[PDB]
């Protein structure tokens, strides 16, 4: 339909405003990682818990780099 494309357009605009907010803080995350982190919080998840794995894994991709 048209409303089946209008929603997929309507989330792309928000995802790019979020991407601008992501790059002005200049966190080391990119769009592909961001696509997981958005999907996880729609089902509900504790942000203090996801920050724990990401703050572990970014210092674990240098001990195993």
């Amino acid at each position: 339909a048209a409303a089946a494309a209008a929603n997929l357009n309507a989330v792309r605009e928000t995802m790019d405003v979020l991407l601008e907010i992501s790059r002005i803080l200049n966190t080391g995350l990119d769009m592909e990682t961001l696509s997981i982190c958005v999907r996880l919080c729609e089902q509900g998840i504790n942000p203090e818990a996801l920050s724990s794995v990401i703050k572990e894994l970014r210092k674990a991709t240098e001990a195993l780099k």
Partner: protein, 116 residues
């Protein structure tokens, strides 16, 4: 999809390794995310807007805070999101310098005055 495989996708995103090459990190991931599959506090999206402001002034990057002041309006203007607190709190949690105290600054509503 389902959350458990989505966390494995996160583990393959940050680490360069694949999912059939690491299993202790996914085990640590199920240890930490587990029993915290929802916020343990109450949302205050206004305060987490104020915390990005309070952070960018603290860095003296005061122009990007006023830029965020318009991006937050765009967030409201589109309105495809019902969890604006989670991602923005998470983005603030992963804070990195583009290049003090918060023990007196207010924290999220803990629900210690309500039976959870």
């Amino acid at each position: 999809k389902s959350p458990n495989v989505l966390l494995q996708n996160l583990c393959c995103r940050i680490l360069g390794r694949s999912e059939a090459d690491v299993a202790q990190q996914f085990q640590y991931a199920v240890r930490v995310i587990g029993s915290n599959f929802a916020p343990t506090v109450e949302r205050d999206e206004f305060l987490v807007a104020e915390k990005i402001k309070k952070e960018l002034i603290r860095q003296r990057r005061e122009a990007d805070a006023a830029l965020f002041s318009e991006l937050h309006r765009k967030l409201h203007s589109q309105g495809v999101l019902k969890n604006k607190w989670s991602i923005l709190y998470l983005l603030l949690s992963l804070s990195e310098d583009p290049r003090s105290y918060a023990t007196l600054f207010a924290q999220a509503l803990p629900r210690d005055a309500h039976s959870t």
